[PDB]
Design an enzyme around this catalytic site. Structure first.
Site, PDB file in Angstrom:
ATOM      1  N   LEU A  99       0.805  -1.213   0.000  1.00 35.89           N
ATOM      2  CA  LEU A  99       0.000   0.000   0.000  1.00 35.89           C
ATOM      3  C   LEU A  99       0.845   1.272   0.000  1.00 35.89           C
ATOM      4  O   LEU A  99       0.449   2.270   0.611  1.00 35.89           O
ATOM      5  CB  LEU A  99      -0.953  -0.006   1.201  1.00 35.89           C
ATOM      6  CG  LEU A  99      -2.303   0.696   1.030  1.00 35.89           C
ATOM      7  CD1 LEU A  99      -3.028   0.162  -0.194  1.00 35.89           C
ATOM      8  CD2 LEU A  99      -3.155   0.547   2.282  1.00 35.89           C
ATOM      9  N   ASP A 100       2.008   1.249  -0.642  1.00 34.26           N
ATOM     10  CA  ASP A 100       2.770   2.475  -0.816  1.00 34.26           C
ATOM     11  C   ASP A 100       2.022   3.419  -1.755  1.00 34.26           C
ATOM     12  O   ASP A 100       1.546   2.993  -2.811  1.00 34.26           O
ATOM     13  CB  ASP A 100       4.160   2.171  -1.375  1.00 34.26           C
TER      14      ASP A 100
END
Lengths: 58, 141, 344, 12, 94, 368, 58
Positions: C77-78
RNA sequence: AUAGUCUCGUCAACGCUCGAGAGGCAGAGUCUCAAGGAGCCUCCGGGGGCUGUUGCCAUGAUAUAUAUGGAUGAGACAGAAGUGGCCCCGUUGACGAGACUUAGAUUAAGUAGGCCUACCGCAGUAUAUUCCUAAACACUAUGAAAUGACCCUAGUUGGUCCAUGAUCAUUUGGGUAAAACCAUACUGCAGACAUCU
């Protein structure tokens, strides 16, 4: 955006920071276009890509 | 006779990078010979490793036709540890001949200023420009 | 001649043959020959995710566009990452983590806060960050921030501009590795400081950017084409079957008469075994496929190669997770010679 | 602090 | 201050106001663990742990009045004994 | 459409490419194909790293400074294991092949003693020879009855150096052989160099590694958590057992054999042709793991012919004790014997008494 | 040392006293390198062989 | 009771390279040894040959010292120091010690109770709900763009973003905040060795 790419002999991407390679080929932006879920222009895109055969299904 | 540059190329180890060009190989061998006249030289894996560990600075020349390869396979990363430039040449007989010994040697470490005598200092001054241009051409690779 | 066969049926002649003869059942279909409802409900999209939305928003967008019942992903989830995003639709969500051991690949731009005195040191620093690494997840990530060890298998510095202070490098890393932390660590080892300017995922598990990657415009245009034209070709072109996620798994071909029993929860036995891989080890994760190439289940191997070749009866595999629906194939158990002989 | 009541439910 | 402190890191270079240290200790430090000298005086706390398993580095979050440029190479930085945890914890269990 | 048709082309089972002790598995005659596999154990190549190292051997190139015992101690120090050993001892100045056994593989050290060794030796002649070929003839005077076989590879009379291959027990006989070559030639000669090219079952071409390889592999696993290089340099102990005739054991009898039972006909699964009485054999599972080195108590035609008997007796047990579950005593005759012991038709030890029915006296033969 | 070798078509060793064979291929020293148990350069060797794919099992 | 296996420490026998040192290997410190010098002859101050199968160092090893080797090394200090750095033969039999067993190798759909239940296999559902509200991220609506906008002790010509929409203001309105697995409860489907010719 800074990340650009060009196409190698094998078809895989060669990534670069340069706009034009040393061989003189213009590099293409690696990032996709911005998408909005409320976009209402699917008909125009589909018609233009069918006029030139660019539809993946076609 | 056939030059050892073209003769020893089949025997060159895969990790022997960077490998000197023929003009660069001739310049390195001439600089090694002048340094040996200056006695500003470390010959063999033992002397080169000990001088690198003490912190001596110069240029490292490694032969390519070394069998087995575990004799010299720790030298390049050890040179990178101590920020010393290194280059590979294909022949160990030529390295020994330029290093003022009859038998071949594996690795040569030119350390300018390693001689206490004043004559060695004068010889260091006369081969200094050749050493500088060789080091710049090696680091340009 | 079997190399051009699609999906899991590729190179099926390399499979060892336990039984060469069977009688087919006219049930089911090929993964590529499914009807459109079953094709979408078993579909996987290799999507070119853009920068601005998060992956959760993109998955919700695909769900709303295709009118799914659920969609899922198992990506990091960068924020601001572009590139490969694997979107699993409906049943394929259960295979959302089937390729975690394959790892991921990234092309990353690092911005350095100051110009390096020595250029090559940057590459050396990258060579220092290859291997098992101590990393802590960043503040933005939803994962709890505790120190972990993540392996970067291979890295390569593509380009570096010291005047522009920008370095493009490629990395192959284990799942769970953050490239933001890697760029911060690169800046820390250099001493000038640095961070992650841009990030692009070029490979996620088995699928890569060259493996039929489409955009969100493609999904919306294909749904529009099917809605207004009743044409399935573009929607079938952008959507891939879930069997694509099951490549690299050891395959066991199951007789048709033994398919639905496996769907009911039965163990697979030797009389239902048809073909199998070389080198299947006990307790391996395997995929059970039919003769048509559709995946029945992910299973755990109960026999090795010698037992698969030379044992007349016994448990071959135990179902770990069932992909296929019940009653797609007829219930044919109870009809075999040994079972009917014991019943009589 | 405590699990949800729907998470840990006793038998009927 | 604790009575027993163990040598933890050696100075490498400053980085953006932080002190980078190569670890001269076999064990891994706790997060935000205080960093001392031989005089038992605190210079800061551990900010970040990084690097490979063979070569571990850590950056120290410098306190008030503690400057990264004031320290030179070869300076040793000390940690308390209870602020170290074994490296076997972060490795996966067999 | 793409559907696997009935009777389509496919790969047939070829056991010639199967690894180690599983090679040529189809050559083994089948006692029974009806058995229940037990989900226990592993393949020797697929063991986890602790069991792979604890069951591993290393084919090593010994350097010319140390002796074999020092190298074995060094390997124990590097790999941090509990036991290391070797069978063929090299002199310090000799290089070449050395098989180093680790932990459980040290059980096979005694068995592989007495195996043949092959050396390549350089002899230095003190003076030049009038005829070169006479040296080869001189070698034929020393070959046989002790040097079993020898071959003259090269001989340079200008360098006064001759390299030749030979097969012998030790290297001191190579010094002796060079001295006798010098005496029968009449010019006099000594040994320049010596190198063992084959020690026992393994040779120099069968994955020989160096001590640097061992150190680097241990370093890679310790600092990188990568096991591929350590798995590459280390071979299973089953590599030392490829010459033995094989008997395949049911999984229910493996643990009983490991504790010390005599393996019997109900435990036999497959057996090899040419097994003769009192021959040394190896007991293997279906996964190819080596249970024990045993002594064949029955012949091949007997193994084909009898319904009861003792098949083999364990000479040296290799496998760990609790790798397989205890599945003895669960068979039909075993439960019947337990019921007779409990119900008084047999005594507490199981011997025949007055209460034993006569049908049990007929059909049951006590192998004890 | 005097013992030299080459690799045959099968991959096995052919032992010679010659530095260069008749075919012209330079021979290799048969004896292994000197080893010390207190060697401290596994990192350097592993890094150099990993730069070129020379690590076994890589 | 009997018998086997594994881990061990002594004696006897038979072999071998004949086995504990003033030993060897690894490592640390100091010193010596590498034709790096000298002469001669050529070529254009330097390059190439000759002296030079010379010289320097080590080596008596089953040994040619008129020899064999020399940094991919050797020698002395060192018959030292140190070993809490390692190494110094094999096979068989017997004795003694500690253990584990005393094993005939089962199961073509399971386990336990009083025909039925409970556990087991697989697939689903739930793991707070509704309204208001705070925050984050991205979009969208309106106005502002090439003398475009922002940052830095600030430029011999700084850097970054920018119609592929930057950066500002109003709030124009909606969107996202997942999925997979574990644990608990509930519901449903089966108990399947896989014929089909």
């Amino acid at each position: 955006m800074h990340l650009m790419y060009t196409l190698g002999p094998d078809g895989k991407r060669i990534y670069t920071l340069k706009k034009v390679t040393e061989s003189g080929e213009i590099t293409k932006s690696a990032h996709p276009a911005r998408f909005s879920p409320d976009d209402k222009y699917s008909r125009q895109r589909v018609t233009l890509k069918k006029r030139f055969g660019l539809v993946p299904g076609q | 006779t056939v030059d050892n540059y073209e003769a020893r190329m089949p025997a060159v180890l895969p990790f022997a990078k960077p490998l000197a060009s023929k003009k660069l190989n001739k310049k390195v061998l001439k600089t090694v010979k002048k340094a040996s006249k200056a006695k500003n030289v470390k010959r063999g894996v033992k002397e080169v490793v000990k001088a690198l560990r003490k912190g001596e600075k110069g240029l490292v020349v490694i032969a390519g036709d070394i069998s087995p390869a575990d004799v010299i396979s720790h030298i390049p990363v050890l040179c990178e540890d101590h920020s010393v430039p290194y280059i590979f040449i294909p022949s160990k007989q030529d390295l020994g001949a330029a290093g003022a010994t009859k038998r071949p040697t594996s690795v040569v470490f030119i350390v300018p200023g390693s001689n206490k005598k004043k004559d060695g200092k004068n010889k260091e001054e006369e081969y200094k420009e050749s050493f500088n241009e060789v080091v710049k051409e090696v680091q340009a690779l | 001649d079997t190399s051009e066969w699609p999906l899991l049926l590729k190179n099926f002649d390399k499979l060892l043959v336990r039984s060469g003869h069977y009688t087919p059942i006219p049930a089911g279909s090929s993964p590529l020959k499914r009807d459109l409802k079953s094709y979408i409900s078993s579909g996987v999209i290799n999507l070119d995710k853009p920068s601005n939305p998060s992956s959760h928003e993109v998955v919700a967008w695909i769900k709303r566009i295709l009118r799914c019942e659920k969609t899922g992903h198992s990506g990091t989830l960068d924020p601001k990452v572009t590139g490969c995003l694997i979107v699993c639709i409906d049943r394929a969500t259960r295979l959302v983590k089937s390729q975690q051991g394959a790892g991921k690949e990234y092309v990353c731009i690092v911005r350095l806060h100051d110009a390096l005195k020595d250029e090559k040191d940057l590459g050396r620093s990258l060579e220092n960050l290859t291997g098992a690494l101590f990393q802590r997840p960043p503040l933005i990530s939803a994962v709890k921030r505790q120190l972990r060890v993540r392996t970067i298998y291979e890295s390569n510095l593509i380009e570096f501009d010291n005047k522009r202070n920008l370095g493009v490098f490629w990395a192959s890393c284990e799942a769970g590795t953050y490239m933001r932390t890697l760029c911060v660590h690169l800046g820390m080892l250099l001493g000038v400081g640095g961070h992650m300017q841009e990030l692009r995922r070029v490979r996620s598990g088995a699928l890569s950017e060259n493996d039929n990657m489409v955009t969100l415009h493609d999904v919306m245009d294909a749904q529009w084409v099917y809605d207004n034209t009743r044409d399935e070709s573009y929607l079938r072109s952008i959507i891939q079957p879930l069997e694509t996620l099951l490549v690299g798994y050891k395959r066991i071909v199951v007789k048709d008469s033994a398919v639905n029993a496996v769907c009911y929860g039965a163990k697979l036995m030797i009389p239902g075994l048809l073909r199998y891989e070389e080198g299947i080890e006990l307790y391996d994760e395997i995929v059970l496929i039919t003769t048509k190439g559709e995946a029945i289940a992910v299973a755990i191997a109960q026999m090795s190669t010698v037992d698969l070749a030379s044992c007349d009866h016994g448990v071959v595999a135990s179902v770990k997770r069932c992909i296929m629906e019940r009653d797609l194939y007829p219930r044919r158990w109870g009809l075999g010679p040994v079972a009917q002989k014991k019943k009589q | 602090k405590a699990p949800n009541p729907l998470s840990v439910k006793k038998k009927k | 201050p604790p009575d027993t402190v163990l040598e933890m890191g050696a100075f490498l270079h400053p980085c953006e106001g932080d002190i980078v240290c190569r670890s001269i200790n076999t064990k891994i430090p706790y997060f935000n663990a205080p960093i001392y000298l031989e005089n038992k005086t605190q210079v800061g706390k551990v900010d970040e742990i990084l690097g490979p398993l063979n070569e571990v580095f850590f950056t120290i979050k410098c306190g008030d009045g503690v400057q990264a440029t004031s320290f030179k190479e070869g300076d040793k930085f000390y940690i308390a004994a209870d602020k170290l945890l074994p490296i076997e914890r972060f490795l996966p269990k067999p």
